[PDB]
Structure formats: structure tokens, C-alpha cells
RNA sequence: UCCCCCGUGCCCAUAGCGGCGUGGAACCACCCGUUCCCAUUCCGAACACGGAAGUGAAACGCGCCAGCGCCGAUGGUACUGGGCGGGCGACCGCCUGGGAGAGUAGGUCGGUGCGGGGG
RNA sequence: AGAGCGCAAGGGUAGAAGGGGGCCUGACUGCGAGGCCUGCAAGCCGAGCAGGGGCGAAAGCCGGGCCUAGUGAACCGGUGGU
RNA sequence: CCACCAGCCUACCAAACCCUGUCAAACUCCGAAGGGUCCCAGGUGGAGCCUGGGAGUGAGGGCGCGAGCGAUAACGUCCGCGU
């Protein structure tokens, strides 16, 4: 069969990939503390009564409804309407 | 020159083709509907004029509406005609390509080196009253490694230009003799 | 990591603690800066031991 | 020219080499040169 | 409002000649003067400390004011100090003391340059300014042999309202600049 | 014979080939043109052999333009060495060719000349072809 | 160019937008929600004293009273290029606790 | 309720860029001064502060133009839910509903909401 | 915005994270709703409330670090201490 | 072929830019059919939900399009949705 040389490797590696993305979409109710966006960068900058933290995360600040937003010369945004 | 014409409707594209007639479209500042015509005669006419000269399509509506072509979108696979666009003429400012006529065999040519042209049609704005059939331009004595561009070409008065015109119109370059096998070394 | 070393901070007047870290290469001697005690209020805290 | 340690001004001359009596004003008070 | 030769003669020669020749129809539009800046690029302070900055203040201490040193950008391993903290001398001059510079410039600095056929014209921005310098440093008034170590050049500048060449040169005929032409 | 010049990743995935050709389906350049009908690779070896074949046929010719470019690795492994272990080695550089794609154009010759040139050269190509003139497509940047 | 959204650093809730010229102060109280403004006073555009500073003091102070005169407690302080020199209205009197 | 300037908000570049013209009787800007508050890693350039006879140059505000940059129909091809084929294979065709990209005509030098100072 | 954003990559970034100085030490303690993630055990997000502070006139943010690597259950025992 | 430094000059090669076509899993101005998912409603089905005891499982294979490996070889292999 002739098993002489065979060029090995040093490549195969990845990541215990955490699940990142828009956790809570619009029309969704939050009790504050519920995070709506797990992102790496700021693809979703804070909205009204939505906060951000150390890992760039849009989470809830009240009990209302997630509302989506875009602002070309300012970025994309995710908010929470009051529901009083 | 003359071709027929046919008012199109809400009939499926594929069928019109695999029946007998290629489909089309026309638009001018405001006038936009859908149209179509025969294949074989259309192909005949096109092979002459196309986006060089003027078309005149007498349409089953009573008139004889004359257009230019514009864009020849095809199927690419086994490439061949399949729906064009038409441009309803007038007298207003319009850019379009004019097929040019490189006349006369230069000195770069006959020395061996052959013309490797750039264009065979130049973009130029004109009033639709001027018909620059074809600028039968010079190319009297192009040399090898020699070029010509800009407003160098004669332009029929009125028929303006529409590039830079530093757009190089053409040039002559070396052949490819068997001495290019010695290059293989 | 070790050789750059780690240390805890201790108050004055006897005890009060926290859990921090150091670094030697920069001409650093007595690591000394503010914090808070369990009992009472704001105090210094001096570098100490392991 | 505010700040503080600013190296000053004051009038200077130019007792040149042509009988020249030039009126100047600079950091040093007694300047004289050539032309 | 401390007036001297170049300032007063700025008023007198400039206004008429300038407008009557070039046609300026605006009080604050006349191709006046703006800042005048001097600069020293010494790559010698790779180390050297501010013992060689004593030579840097030396430069601006004879021009009147207190100099400010800057530094450098990125890596020049081919020629040492990269990180960018050796020396970069700059001083900006407004009206009055700027007029001091221009004065001492035209009066005595230029004289004892031996090979002086006049200044280098072509060095005009085109967008409307002028940039040069010199070699022999001690040509300046308040500095005799003692101060300097060996040799040291300099890079001056002149910022002006000037938008063309000729108006700038004429501006330097009314403000009087010894050219080679 | 063409390839890049050391760039990004060396090894890449061959993949299946559809047939939209994405583009490149008229003359614009030369005057007579060889275009293909079978979705395959063009081989740098072949590429050169065909370019030659043309040149060869017509001594002291004109200018033969090459539109397609052979810039894809041949992931090839050694012989009788058992599976797994590493990908392969980048080898034989080729290109994606999807039918209805211009690959070479002849300009400034006889009719007969470009006929037999494109004929023989493409006859040497890894597949078979069609040879077209220059007209029905005019107007395309 | 003191944009920086010094606005945002004060866009906690409820602004008070003021700015100066060569000679005239422009003290205004802007409420957001839809964009509706509210309360005004101007050093040399209320037809007042011609000494920038003190007028401004009084003018803010004028406005200051005006604030509480129409139901105002605490708001923000929209000022661009300040160098913080108080403008000793600073609306510190200014009901609001400007300072 | 209106025609103009200013402090300021909303859409997101049909608002930006650029040649032309421009208005200051109030607003606005340069500009007058650098001694009192303040500060330039140096300059009163910048922020700062007390202030005129000028100016409308710039900055800016407004109008015209498309020249850059921006948006961009219509048609038809791509690609494809889901449904049936044909070829050893590399791959190809019919059905239905969805429906781009690039380009073609054309279009664009903004839209609007607030609060004061003017007639 | 193509540079710097400590070090690999990717997202992100001047309407600042970058870069300058002043001040300081919240690289807090006692907790912690409601979440991300999820076979378990781990890891990851954070307002808020009390203390008592640092900065700023304030408005305000501060429970380390632009973000994701820089790590080790338990048993054993040393350590200062109640 | 002159210098305080200049000037004009090629079928050699070549920074960039421009025109002429084009290439891409780790390139992206654009970007669908799909897909995931939060509310309005139909939906009565060995549906779905909640505690609770007993499990057995954890060598799989085939077929279709979808990507990798392989040589666009293997009744080859390793995943994806589907059967």
C-alpha cells in the first residue's frame, strides 16, 4: 500500500459559539431586565427606555413594547414604548 | 426605417417568444406601455440599423411611430435575442452611440503592427434632426505604439460629444509572431 | 500572573479587606490608595503579603 | 503674548556700519549690526 | 497698537498701491498679512534630552517669545526615534511681535548672508503664501558667536490673505522683500 | 498560462457549477470570438495550448485577447497515501467556465484565419464550443 | 463644533436651549416630546440693557422667575461653546438649580 | 393669521459637493481692545471677557443651474417557495405563486415642525 | 473614517471607544428584579435600593478595561481574621 | 547634453488614476424566493400543557436537493432539511 509521507495540519479550531442576535423583536412585551439584543458591535444602538451595558446589549427598562427604528446618519435602534 | 409594431398587454413573456413574437417596451419622458413584434423580420431589420440608425415602427393603432432601439437584454445562456427596449424619438437633446468609420490604411499598419481599436461606436449628444450616419473618420497614418483620442475626430456640426473626450478612440499594437514561442523558454 | 504578582489590601487601625492585583516593573513600592472598610467609613489601605 | 515665563520684548537699535540710526523693538535692548 | 517701521509702512505703501493696482473694493478683504510661523526639524533629539532644547529656546528667545516643542508620528527605524518624542520646534507670530520678526528679518538677518542674490521667488504656494528658511543662524541680531554650537538651519513661513502670486509679491514690494526675482 | 501572485487563502473549495455565467457574452473586443457550451474548467495547460494553437496556425498574426482568467487551485493529494490528513495541495490552476461565456477573441485576420484558429484552438479545449462574429449584442459596458 | 451631543450628555430629560451672538443673548426653554420649546428671554432682544453680561444675568433671572411663573422645577442646560463662565445668571438663580 | 433673520427640532444624501448672484435699516458674522474672569503643551488662532467709525470680504442666510455625488420606474431575464419530469454523469426542461442585481427613460441642489426679534 | 482603536480575528468606532490635561481611586461593601445561555454544573447581562464616597456648577456617569481569549469543580492544607 | 539648477527626449518596463472586460467560502453599495419569530383569528386533534413511576435508546442505513472531503471516483465519506 506504501504509507510514506502525508502532509499534516494546524488549522481545525472554532468556538463554543454563544447565540447572538435580536433576542426580543417588536410587538413583544418586557418586564424590564429582558435583553432584546445580544450583539458584538453596536448594530443596534439604544432606544427609548432601553439600556446598554458592557457587552453592547439592548435590554429593557420598563414594561412595554419593543419598537424598531432606523436612522441612516445615526444608525439602527431598538426601543420600548411605555404602555401606561 | 420601417418595421411593424404590436401593442402588448398582460400576456406571459415566455409564451409570446415560444409562439412567434419577441416582446418589447417603449418609453419617452412620460409615454410608457408594453410592446412586441415578429422575430425573423425584426432580426433582419435590427442586423442593419439597431442602435446605430433610426427605426420606424408602424403600429396597429393607426399611426407609424418611429423610435430608436436601446438595450438588448438576452438570456445569455445559448445567448441570443429575448426582449429589447425602444426609445420614442422627438427633437430634444439625446445622447447615443455613432458607429465610426476608420478609413485609410496607416503606417503603423503595413509595417506589420495592426490596429487594436478601442471603440466602434461613440457616445455623443445630438438633436434628433442631425443623423450622423457614421463619422467616416481618418486614421490616415497611425504608427506602431502611436495613439489618437479626444476631439481628434471630426464631428458633424451640432452633433456634440459625450465622453472626456480623452477617451482613446483606438491605437495600433504589435502582432504575435512565432517569436512569441521563443518567449516560452 | 505570578512574577508581576498579586496582592490584597489592608486598612489601618486593625483589619478591613479587599481583593486586587499589582505589578512590579514600574517603580512601584508601597501600593497605597483609597477604599472602604466593612466597619466605619473611607480609609487608605496598605499593600500586604501574599 | 501672555503666559508667564515669556522671554520679554523692549526697544533695540541698529548701530550698523553706515551711520544708520535704526529704531527697533525686540527681546534684547542693545542691537547693532551691519547694514 | 505698538507701531514701528514695517507696520507704519505697511499702512502707507500697502493700501494705495495694492488697491489701485489690483482693485480691492472691501475694507477687510485687502490681501493683508496673517500669521508668521518658524519651525525647526531636529532629528538629533533621538535622546539628547532638553539640553538640546536649550538650543531650541535659544532660537525663539532671540525672536522674543517662549517657544513650544512638539513631537512626531510613527516609526522610522531606518533613522532612529520612531515612537515620536525627540524635538519639533514651532512658534506662531501675530501682528505686533510678528512685525518684530519681519523687521529684524528684513533689516539684519538678510544682510550677512554673503552669497545673497536675493530670495527664492518660485517658492510660492500658488494658493497664496510663501515658505523658506536659512542656514547661517547667528545672522540674527541678539545672538553672537557664543550661543550656537556649530550649524543650525530653520523653516519659517508666512500666511497671508493673498490668493495669487503677483499680489503677494507686490504686497512684498509695499512690505518690501529683498528678492532675487 | 496565467495565475495570481500569492494572495489571501491558498486552498479553496471547488464547488458545483450552475449556469448563469454571471456575465461575459459578447465580442466588444476583437472581431471573431470563441465561446463555450459545456460547464467545466478551463485548464491553464489547455489555455496556453489553445492560445498557442491559434498563434501557431497564423504566423505573424494580430492580437489574441484572453477574457477568462485561470485563478483557482487544484486541491490534489499525493498517491496511495491513505485518506484524511490535510486537504491536498493547491496544484493545477484553472478557472470556472459556464457556457455562454466569451473566452478568446481574434482581431485583424482573414475570415478563414480566425475560423480555423478558433476552430483548432478550441478543438484543443477541454470541451467543445461555438464560434461567433460580432453584432447582435452591441451596447454593453 | 462643540456638537458632541453635549445635548445627549444633558438629554437625560427636559432641555433649556440658550446661545449668544456678538451682543445679544438668546435664552430659551425648549421641551422635546414633539419639539415644542416654551420659555423666552433675551439680553438685547427683549429691548434691554446694552452690557452683555449683567443683562444676561438679569435676563436669565427674568426668565428664571418666568420659569416658576408658568410651572417649572428642574430641566437641562443646552450650551455649546461655554468655557463655563457661568454667565452668572448661570440660571443658578434660575429656579431650575442651574448652579 | 402672513413675507424675513435668528436660538433649535424631524425625515435621512432627490438635503452633499461646485460655478454664478447675493442680504444686513433689526437680527447674524467678521471686526474694535487684550487692562478685570479666563486660557493657548506657543500665538487672544480656539474658547474667554470689556467694546466702535467700518464692513457684508469671509462665515453664514437666500435664489439659479445637474456639472460631480443621490434616488430611480417600466419591462423582461436571474434566483427560488411548493409541485412533476429528463440524462451514467457533469446537468437540463414543464407548472404555480413570489420576484432582484446591473442597467433604460426620467427625476433631484431639499421637506417640514417649533419659539422669539422685525414690516 | 480607509488611522489609531494594547496582542489573532471579526463586528463596532469621531454625534469617540481614539488623543490632551486636571482631579481621583466605584479594580466599592451589603444585595439584587427581570433576562441571555443552557443535559447538569459553569459562564455572560443590569437597572434599581441602602451605605458611604470620586468627578462635575450642574444635568449626570462611576460595582474596571471598545467587545468577544488571558483560564481550573471538589477534596488537601497554608493565610490574616470573628 | 548645462549646473547657484537646468532642459528636451523611446515597439523597455512600470506607483496611481482613467477607459476596456471580469474573478470570490472566509470581498460587499444591493440583495430576493425562503426562514425564524411576536400579536389578530380560525384548529377538537392518541394536539399541545403540569406533576409523577417504569422504560428502552445513544453501531444506523437508504433516497432528494443543499455545502465539505475525495478526482464535481467509490454501494466511499462528514454534515445540513427532507423522506
From Swiss-Prot, chain B:
Family the UniProt entry places it in: Belongs to the bacterial ribosomal protein bL25 family. CTC subfamily.
InterPro entries for the chain: Rbsml_bL25/Gln-tRNA_synth_N (IPR020056), Ribosomal_bL25/Gln-tRNA_synth (IPR011035), Ribosomal_bL25_b-dom (IPR020057), Ribosomal_bL25_C (IPR037121), Ribosomal_bL25_long (IPR001021), Ribosomal_L25_dom (IPR029751), Ribosomal_uL5_bac-type (IPR020930)
NCBIfam families registered for this protein in UniProt: bL25_bact_ctc
Highest taxon of source: Bacteria
Protein name, per record: Large ribosomal subunit protein bL25
Keyword Cell inner membrane among UniProt keywords: no
Annotated function: This is one of the proteins that binds to the 5S RNA in the ribosome where it forms part of the central protuberance.
Keywords: Ribonucleoprotein, Ribosomal protein, RNA-binding, rRNA-binding
Recorded GO CC terms: cytosolic large ribosomal subunit
A molecular-function term among this protein's GO annotations: structural constituent of ribosome
GO biological processes: translation
UniProtKB/Swiss-Prot annotation, chain C:
Ribonucleoprotein listed as a keyword: yes
Annotated protein name in UniProt: Large ribosomal subunit protein bL33
GO BP field: translation
High-level lineage: Bacteria, Thermotogati, Deinococcota, Deinococci, Thermales
PANTHER family cross-referenced by the UniProt entry: 50S RIBOSOMAL PROTEIN L33, CHLOROPLASTIC, LARGE RIBOSOMAL SUBUNIT PROTEIN BL33C
Gene name linked to the record: rpmG
Transmembrane stretches, start-end: none
Keywords in alphabetical order: Ribonucleoprotein, Ribosomal protein
Stored InterPro entries: Ribosomal_bL33, Ribosomal_bL33_CS, Ribosomal_bL33_sf, Ribosomal_zn-bd
A Pfam family recorded for this sequence: Ribosomal_L33
UniProtKB/Swiss-Prot annotation, chain D:
Ligand binding (Zn(2+)): 16, 18
Keyword Zinc: yes
GO CC terms in record: ribonucleoprotein complex; ribosome
GO MF entry, a single one: metal ion binding
Keyword RNA-binding: yes
Taxonomy, superkingdom: Bacteria
Key words, A-Z: Metal-binding, Ribonucleoprotein, Ribosomal protein, RNA-binding, rRNA-binding, Zinc
GO biological process: translation
Function: Binds the 23S rRNA.
Protein family per UniProt: Belongs to the bacterial ribosomal protein bL31 family. Type A subfamily.
Subunit-structure text: Part of the 50S ribosomal subunit.
Protein name per the record: Large ribosomal subunit protein bL31
Organism: Thermus thermophilus (strain ATCC BAA-163 / DSM 7039 / HB27)
Gene name for this UniProt entry: rpmE
UniProtKB/Swiss-Prot annotation, chain F:
InterPro entries according to UniProt: Ribosomal_uL16, Ribosomal_uL16_bact-type, Ribosomal_uL16_dom, Ribosomal_uL16_sf
UniProt xrefs under Gene3D superfamilies: Ribosomal protein L10e/L16
GO biological process terms held by the UniProt record: translation
One of the record's GO molecular function terms: rRNA binding
Key words, A-Z: Ribonucleoprotein, Ribosomal protein, RNA-binding, rRNA-binding, tRNA-binding
Keyword hit for rRNA-binding: yes
GO cellular component terms, semicolon-separated: cytosolic large ribosomal subunit
Pfam families (alphabetical): Ribosomal_L16
Record PANTHER family: 50S/60S RIBOSOMAL PROTEIN L16, LARGE RIBOSOMAL SUBUNIT PROTEIN UL16M
Family, per entry: Belongs to the universal ribosomal protein uL16 family.
UniProt cross-references to NCBIfam families, sorted A to Z: rplP_bact
Subunit structure and binding partners: Part of the 50S ribosomal subunit.
Its biological purpose: Binds 23S rRNA and is also seen to make contacts with the A and possibly P site tRNAs.
Protein name: Large ribosomal subunit protein uL16
Organism: Thermus thermophilus (strain ATCC BAA-163 / DSM 7039 / HB27)
Amino acid at each position: 500500500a506504501h504509507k510514506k509521507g502525508l502532509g499534516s495540519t494546524r488549522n481545525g479550531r472554532d468556538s463554543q459559539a454563544k447565540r447572538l442576535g435580536v433576542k426580543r423583536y417588536e410587538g413583544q412585551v418586557v418586564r424590564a431586565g429582558n435583553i432584546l439584543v445580544r450583539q458584538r458591535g453596536t448594530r443596534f444602538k439604544p432606544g427609548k427606555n432601553v439600556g446598554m451595558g458592557r457587552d453592547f446589549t439592548l435590554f429593557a427598562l420598563v414594561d412595554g413594547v419593543v419598537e424598531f427604528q432606523d436612522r441612516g446618519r445615526l444608525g439602527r435602534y431598538v426601543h420600548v414604548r411605555p404602555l401606561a | 426605417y420601417r418595421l411593424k409594431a404590436y401593442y402588448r398587454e398582460g400576456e406571459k413573456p415566455s409564451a409570446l417568444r415560444r409562439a412567434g413574437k419577441l416582446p418589447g417596451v417603449m418609453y419617452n419622458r412620460h409615454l410608457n406601455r408594453k410592446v412586441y413584434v415578429d422575430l425573423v423580420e425584426f432580426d433582419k431589420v435590427f442586423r442593419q440599423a439597431s442602435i446605430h440608425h433610426v427605426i420606424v415602427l408602424e403600429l396597429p393603432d393607426g399611426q407609424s411611430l418611429p423610435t430608436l432601439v436601446r438595450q438588448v437584454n438576452l438570456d445569455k445562456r445559448r445567448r441570443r435575442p429575448e426582449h429589447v427596449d425602444f426609445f420614442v424619438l422627438s427633437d430634444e437633446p439625446v445622447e447615443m452611440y455613432v458607429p465610426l468609420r476608420f478609413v485609410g490604411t496607416p503606417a503603423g499598419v503595413r509595417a506589420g503592427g495592426v490596429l487594436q481599436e478601442i471603440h466602434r461606436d461613440i457616445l455623443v449628444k445630438v438633436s434628433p434632426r442631425n443623423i450622423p450616419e457614421f463619422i467616416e473618420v481618418d486614421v490616415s497614418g497611425l504608427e506602431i505604439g502611436d495613439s489618437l483620442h479626444a476631439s481628434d475626430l471630426k464631428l458633424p456640426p451640432g452633433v456634440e460629444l459625450a465622453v472626456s473626450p480623452e477617451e482613446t478612440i483606438a491605437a495600433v499594437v504589435p502582432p504575435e509572431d512565432v517569436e512569441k514561442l521563443a518567449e516560452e523558454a | 500572573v505570578r512574577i508581576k504578582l498579586l496582592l490584597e489590601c489592608t486598612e489601618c487601625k486593625r483589619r478591613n479587606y479587599a481583593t486586587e492585583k499589582n505589578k512590579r516593573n514600574t517603580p512601584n513600592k508601597l501600593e497605597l490608595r483609597k477604599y472602604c472598610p466593612w466597619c466605619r467609613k473611607h480609609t487608605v489601605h496598605r499593600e500586604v503579603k501574599i | 503674548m501672555k503666559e508667564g515665563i515669556h522671554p520679554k520684548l523692549v526697544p533695540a537699535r541698529i548701530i550698523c556700519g553706515c551711520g544708520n540710526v535704526i529704531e527697533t523693538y525686540s527681546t534684547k535692548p542693545e542691537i547693532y549690526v551691519e547694514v | 497698537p505698538l507701531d514701528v517701521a514695517l507696520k507704519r509702512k505697511y499702512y502707507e505703501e500697502v493700501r494705495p498701491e495694492l488697491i489701485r493696482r489690483f482693485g480691492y473694493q472691501n475694507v477687510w478683504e485687502v490681501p493683508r498679512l496673517e500669521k508668521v510661523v518658524i519651525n525647526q526639524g531636529l532629528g538629533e533629539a533621538k535622546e539628547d534630552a532638553r539640553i538640546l532644547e536649550k538650543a531650541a529656546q535659544e532660537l525663539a528667545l532671540i525672536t522674543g517669545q517662549k517657544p513650544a516643542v512638539t513631537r512626531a508620528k510613527k516609526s522610522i527605524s531606518n533613522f532612529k526615534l520612531r515612537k515620536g518624542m525627540p524635538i519639533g520646534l514651532r512658534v506662531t507670530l501675530r501682528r505686533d511681535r510678528m512685525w518684530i520678526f519681519l523687521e529684524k528679518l528684513l533689516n539684519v538677518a538678510l544682510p550677512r548672508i554673503r552669497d545673497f542674490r536675493g530670495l527664492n521667488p518660485n517658492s510660492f504656494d500658488g494658493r497664496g503664501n510663501y515658505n523658506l528658511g536659512l542656514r547661517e543662524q547667528l545672522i540674527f541680531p541678539e545672538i553672537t558667536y557664543d550661543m550656537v554650537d556649530a550649524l543650525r538651519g530653520m523653516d519659517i513661513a508666512v500666511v497671508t490673505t493673498a490668493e495669487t502670486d503677483e499680489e503677494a509679491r507686490a504686497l512684498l514690494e509695499l512690505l518690501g522683500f529683498p528678492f532675487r526675482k | 498560462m496565467l495565475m495570481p501572485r500569492r494572495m489571501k487563502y491558498r486552498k479553496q473549495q471547488r464547488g458545483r457549477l450552475k449556469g448563469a455565467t454571471k456575465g461575459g457574452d459578447y465580442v466588444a473586443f476583437g472581431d471573431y470570438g470563441l465561446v463555450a457550451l459545456e460547464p467545466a474548467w478551463i485548464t491553464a495547460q489547455q489555455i496556453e495550448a489553445a492560445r498557442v494553437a491559434m498563434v501557431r496556425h497564423f504566423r505573424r498574426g494580430g492580437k489574441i485577447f484572453i477574457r477568462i482568467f485561470p485563478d483557482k487551485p487544484y486541491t490534489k493529494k499525493p498517491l496511495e497515501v491513505r485518506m484524511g490528513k490535510g486537504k491536498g495541495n493547491v496544484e493545477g490552476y484553472v478557472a470556472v467556465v459556464k457556457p455562454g461565456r466569451v473566452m478568446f477573441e481574434v482581431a485583424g485576420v482573414t475570415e478563414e484565419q480566425a475560423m480555423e484558429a478558433l476552430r483548432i484552438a478550441g478543438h484543443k479545449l477541454p470541451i467543445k464550443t461555438k464560434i461567433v462574429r460580432r453584432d447582435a449584442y452591441d451596447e454593453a459596458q | 463644533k462643540f456638537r458632541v451631543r453635549n445635548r445627549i450628555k444633558r438629554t437625560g430629560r427636559l432641555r433649556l436651549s440658550v446661545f449668544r451672538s456678538l451682543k445679544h443673548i438668546y435664552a430659551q426653554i425648549i421641551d422635546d416630546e414633539k419639539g415644542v420649546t416654551l420659555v423666552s428671554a433675551s439680553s438685547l432682544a427683549l429691548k434691554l440693557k446694552g452690557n452683555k453680561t449683567e443683562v444676561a444675568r438679569q435676563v436669565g433671572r427674568a426668565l428664571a422667575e418666568k420659569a416658576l411663573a408658568l410651572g417649572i422645577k428642574q430641566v437641562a442646560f443646552d450650551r455649546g461653546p461655554y468655557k463655563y463662565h457661568g454667565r452668572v445668571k448661570a440660571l443658578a438663580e434660575g429656579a431650575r438649580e442651574g448652579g
